[PDB]
Amino acid sequence: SEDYKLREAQRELDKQRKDTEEIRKRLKEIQRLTDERTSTADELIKELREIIRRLQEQSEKLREIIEELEKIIRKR
Amino acid sequence: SEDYKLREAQRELDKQRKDTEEIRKRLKEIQRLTDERTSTADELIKELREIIRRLQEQSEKLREIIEELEKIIRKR
């Protein structure tokens, strides 16, 4: 069954890789705005708080993958 | 051999669990700075930049673990 779970771990890891890269890109965008001085501090803060939330989510996804891999090792 | 490599992977997963907790703690800290609003967007962006780098590193290590478990499970 570990084969099923390992495939799941792989699929999910590929998804967070892709999701995290999108977050990085958004952060680049925010850096651009900051440098351009086109947004208010409040506006910038709002977008940064959203980045933080997205990263917390990605962190949790990795935690779950780790948990599953440990189950695999302990089972197989 | 395999039992050896399984112990290796588990040791690495233990480390990763610790790294995840650190990432989680740092994101909380960064969120708190956002609230104080005693910091610049550049400074906040720098700290988030570092979190992303750390997640990417974690991700690549998990990818490695999965590949080695692939080899074992393939055999099993």
Chain B residues with CB under 8 Å of A68 CB are none
What was the structure determination method? X-ray
User: CA–CA separation, A2 vs A12, rounded Å?
Assistant: 15
Helices A2-36, B41-75: crossing angle, 10 deg rounding: 160
DSSP A23-48: HHHHHHHHHHHHHHT-S-HHHHHHHH
Contact partners, residue A69, CB within 8 Å, separation at least 6: A6, A9, B9, B13, B62, B65, B66, B69
Between chain A and chain B, the number of residue pairs with CB atoms below 8 A apart is 102
Domain count, chain A: 1
H-state helical runs in chain B: 2-36, 41-75
Q: How many other β-carbons are positioned within 10 Å of the β-carbon of residue A17? A: 16
Chain A residues with CB under 8 Å of B72 CB are 76
**Cβ contact B34:A49 at 8 Å:** yes
Q: Domain range for residue B63?
A: 1-76
